[PDB]
């Protein structure tokens, strides 16, 4: 299988790795939110875009990019816009979305984007060939924060996301049933077993599925997700060192 | 939903509980092995009678429960004889292993027996009756070393525990891929919607099933096992490290 190295860190070995999200409106908050993150331990640093409020203003993603890099110089940067329509804050035209994620790519500022998989299979394709061009990973992602698909839905989506060039496969979904987080678990085990060749990430959302952020290493799911959520990140870390080692 | 009540400790509430099991093959071992455990954080202290080398002389046994018993002061004591058919370390007669529950029962020395599921309905359900009649609680066992039943078996099979009396249903298998670890904790969620009404225990072993240690909590399993420094079955952690798992579960 496939590993995949962002900066020194190796994404698919060792214990799962620690993302960890940062939302803020405006320059200010994007910049008090970074301090805040600072001595957090964690992985990777998402910056939620999505929060931001000049989404639309160029120079002005630009320069948060910039004011987190400056904060954090020790940490791969993932910038991601979610969509209102899975979770997010708001919307974008398809080409707006693209055209805020090359626009990424092109600044050197981050070391990995997120790409929606049902943006259009034509878009999704042209901009990981962008991102790659550039050495930018791309963690492709799904999401239904309404309820759990069936194990084989999850599958085929997770198989599309490697068909369409992911780097990092990820799905999260919303269980609404104990089964519902089991469900998310089989299909981390037959995407595993069947057709991965590559890292992957799998997480059941809420309370109830909080078992699949701790004890996923077994099951093949590569990261999560920790707070500084439904988890701190110190407690993450502390339980996915028991788990590596037992 | 009943729970299950020893000293003060509440099973079927709450974070799950930790048993440890205690093996020695002498009294000297039993004392030694106490000493050893009575720092550890669990809350049930199992004798694993199997590995007791004098199972069959009645004086020796009850002088190791004493012996434990004056040890461990603060501890619910949990009477446990595996079969060598279901994974233990000797066999006896039906009727020996019968005789050697119901002495542990009148010795007053223990709070809780282990009976296997299928010794045999009859002398289940007598043994049960004796052993409630005493106010001691009673955990009704199955164990597959080598497979995992279907799902449904394994509901069916903790459904006939409550049926013949079980204070706690238990089961413990064998995954032969991680989809069975997956097939036993989806067992477990179906008992507690179809059929329980009292605290069940359920375990997939091996490094592979140590999901099925943890979340208890989230799935419907009361207790689970951890090690002191070794474990009977494969795929424990320490109970420390067990106990600062099922913390962060219990308050997420
Ligand atoms: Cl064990
Ligand atoms: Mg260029
Ligand atoms: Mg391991
Ligand atoms: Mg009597
Ligand atoms: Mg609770």
Do not use: C
Request: glycine share 6%.
């Amino acid at each position: 299988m496939k590993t995949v190295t962002v900066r020194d860190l190796v994404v698919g070995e060792g214990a799962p790795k620690i993302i960890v999200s940062l939302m803020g409106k405006t320059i200010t908050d994007v910049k008090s939110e970074a301090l805040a993150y600072r001595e957090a331990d964690f992985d990777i640093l998402e910056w939620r875009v999505d929060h931001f409020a000049n989404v639309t203003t160029a120079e002005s993603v630009l320069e948060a990019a910039g004011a987190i890099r400056e904060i954090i110089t020790d940490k791969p940067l993932l910038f991601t816009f979610r969509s209102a329509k899975e979770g997010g804050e708001q919307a974008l035209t398809t080409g707006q979305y693209i055209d805020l994620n090359r626009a990424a790519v092109d600044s050197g500022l981050v070391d990995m984007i997120d790409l929606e998989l049902f943006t259009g299979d034509d878009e999704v394709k042209a901009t990981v060939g962008y991102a790659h061009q550039h050495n930018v990973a791309v963690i492709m992602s799904n999401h239904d924060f309404h309820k759990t698909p069936a194990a084989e839905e999850i599958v085929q989506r997770l198989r599309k996301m490697q068909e369409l060039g992911a780097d990092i496969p990820k799905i999260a979904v919303m269980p609404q049933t104990k089964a519902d987080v089991l469900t998310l678990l089989t299909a981390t085990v037959e995407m595993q077993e069947r057709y991965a060749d590559r890292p992957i990430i799998t997480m059941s959302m809420s309370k109830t599925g909080v078992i699949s952020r701790l004890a996923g290493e077994v099951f093949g799911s590569a990261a999560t997700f920790g707070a500084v959520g439904a988890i701190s990140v110190a407690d993450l870390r502390t339980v996915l060192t028991i788990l590596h080692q037992a």
